[PDB]
Each structure stands twice: as structure tokens, then as C-alpha cells.
UniProtKB/TrEMBL annotation, chain A:
It comes from Tetrahymena thermophila (strain SB210). It comes from the Eukaryota. This is Uncharacterized protein.
TrEMBL record, chain B:
The chain holds residues 91 to 346 of 346 of the full protein. This is Cation channel family protein. It comes from Tetrahymena thermophila (strain SB210). It comes from the Eukaryota. Residues 45-232 form the LSDAT prokaryote domain.
Length: 49, 256
């Protein structure tokens, strides 16, 4: 969302650190954020008779 | 004896360690012996809450407690109810309260009415500070609180290493924040200004405003000078993930 008031230099340093931790330790220092996607699915009009 | 430890049982609550300090102005206070007796001998990351009181920040405190759990950080506050307590209890976090003994009340057993200055269940360690005359007021404990925080972050002198990181979280839900901010700036400690109090909301709003549009109605002139001299970071969010990310960042890295 661009809400973190961070200098770009620190943003790149943090990403490089995260990639290093993900390769070496299989862990991310970045917290996962949820992305909600509206999907349109088909449902049959089963008549509630 | 300048201090005396006790076991303190909260009514319907957890067992805490309570330490009475009989003279807060005692020269060379023996923090090493105190912390050894409490088994607080490792270096811990510290999150210091400045002006913590009861507030509508529920989910924000859940995020703060999560970041403190993942970093093994000790939370330090003013020993009164804040709304952090449920998250601290569930995660077995160390919550350290520092208050003047005369300004806080002991919780009553089966009391239908909670006093806002009652000691809150969830504190694992309580430091009740006194002067010789037992006349200590709020803000007068602040020097002891910061010296305790610095010693908790250093740990045992035999561990040749840098102290653990300390971050201050300015909540300003109480008006008595100024002396603690003055000391935090003096020790070159980072301060996160968190949304949700009138004082913090004014600071955040003025940090985004151009200099000509700055309106200070609640913030004293001394605090305006401290904002220019100290390392202040504005958090314009009450989201649990945003505060967790800020705390985790400042406990791991010093950006200045």
C-alpha cells in the first residue's frame, strides 16, 4: 500500500535481506499480506421447491 | 536494603514478581543484583510504552504483542491497565510495569469496580518505586524506568556484546509523557509515534503538514524542540500488521 514511510535505500536493503533469509533459512522476514480477489462462480439455480 | 522483592498474586490472575524500591534517588542503584534475583540476566530487546493507559487500541496491541513474541522482547509500561494484557497473558510475554507506589492501587479481591490506577493482571514484573518520604508522583519514576530498560537490554556484564535494541512507542494516552520522551531523546533511542491519542494524532498531522500550516494546540513547546532533536518515526495506522512491522524493524535495525 506504500504506507511504510521508508527511504528507498532501506527498502532495497530489506528485500535483499529477506531473499538471503529465504534462500538460507527457508524463512521470510516479510509478513505475508492477504490479497482478497472477488471471483465470480457459476451456481445452478436449483429450484428450492 | 534499597529494594525488596515479593511474589505478588493478582486476584483471579497470574503470579507476578513485585519489587519495592525504597529510594529511587539512591546513587549507583544495584540493578545487577536486582535483575539476577529476578532471573532477568540475559540481554532482551525492549519495547517501552510511553504514556500507556486504557485505550481503544485492541487489535494494535495484538500486533505489538506478536512482534514482541517473535523478537523475544520485554514490554515495559506504567503498570496500569492498557488493553495489552490479554495478548501478553496468551503469548507468555514479559510485561514489566514501573510506577510510583503512591500513584497505583493494589487490585481488590472480587471488586465490581476497577480503579483506572489499579495494577493490571498480565504484568510479570512490577517495580513500585518510592522516595524516602513516600511522596513520589507520576513522571518522577521516569529516570528509574529508563535506567532499568538500559540494564535489561545490556544483560549480564560478562556477555561482551552490544546491548539489545530498544524502541519507544509513544502512545500519549496520559499527559505525563514529556519527561520520558526527554530522556529517550537524551539516550538516542528511536521513538515510534502511534496514532490513537489526541497528542499523537496532532504530532502525526503536523509531521505531514507544511511548516506554515503547522498548528500546535495540545503539544508543548518543549515537545516541539524534542521532535527536531530526536529520532521520531510517525505511524499513521492502527493496523496490527503495521505496528508489528515497525516494532520488528526497530528491534532488528537502527535506521540512523
Amino acid at each position: 500500500k506504500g504506507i511504510l514511510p521508508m527511504k528507498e535505500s532501506f527498502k532495497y536493503a530489506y528485500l535483499v535481506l529477506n531473499d538471503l533469509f529465504q534462500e538460507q533459512l527457508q524463512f521470510s522476514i516479510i509478513e505475508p499480506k492477504s490479497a482478497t480477489k472477488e471471483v465470480v462462480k457459476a451456481q445452478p439455480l436449483i429450484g428450492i421447491t | 536494603q534499597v529494594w525488596k522483592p515479593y511474589d505478588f498474586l493478582f486476584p483471579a490472575g497470574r503470579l507476578a514478581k513485585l519489587v519495592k524500591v525504597f529510594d529511587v534517588y539512591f546513587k549507583n542503584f544495584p540493578f545487577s543484583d536486582l535483575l539476577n534475583k529476578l532471573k532477568l540476566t540475559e540481554g532482551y530487546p525492549i519495547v517501552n510504552l510511553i504514556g500507556a493507559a486504557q485505550s481503544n487500541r485492541g487489535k494494535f496491541y495484538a500486533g505489538l504483542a506478536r512482534a514482541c513474541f517473535n523478537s523475544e522482547a520485554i514490554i515495559v509500561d506504567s503498570a496500569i491497565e492498557t488493553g495489552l494484557e490479554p495478548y501478553v497473558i496468551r503469548r507468555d510475554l514479559k510485561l514489566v510495569g514501573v510506577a510510583p507506589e503512591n500513584c497505583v492501587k493494589y487490585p481488590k479481591i472480587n471488586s465490581t469496580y476497577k480503579d483506572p490506577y489499579e495494577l493490571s493482571n498480565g504484568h510479570t514484573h512490577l517495580f513500585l518505586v518510592n522516595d524516602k518520604d513516600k511522596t513520589l508522583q507520576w513522571s518522577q519514576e521516569t529516570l528509574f524506568k529508563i535506567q532499568l530498560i538500559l540494564k535489561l537490554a545490556e544483560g549480564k556484564v560478562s556477555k561482551k556484546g552490544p546491548r539489545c535494541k530498544i524502541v519507544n512507542v509513544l502512545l500519549a494516552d496520559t499527559p505525563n509523557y514529556l519527561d520520558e520522551v526527554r530522556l529517550a531523546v537524551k539516550y538516542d533511542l528511536p521513538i515510534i509515534v502511534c496514532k490513537g491519542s489526541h497528542i499523537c494524532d496532532e504530532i502525526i498531522k503536523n509531521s505531514k503538514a507544511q511548516e506554515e500550516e503547522k498548528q500546535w494546540n495540545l503539544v508543548d513547546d518543549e515537545m516541539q524542540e524534542l521532535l527536531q532533536k530526536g529520532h521520531f518515526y510517525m505511524l499513521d495506522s492502527l493496523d496490527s500488521e503495521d505496528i508489528a512491522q515497525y516494532i520488528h524493524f526497530f528491534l532488528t535495525f537502527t535506521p540512523y
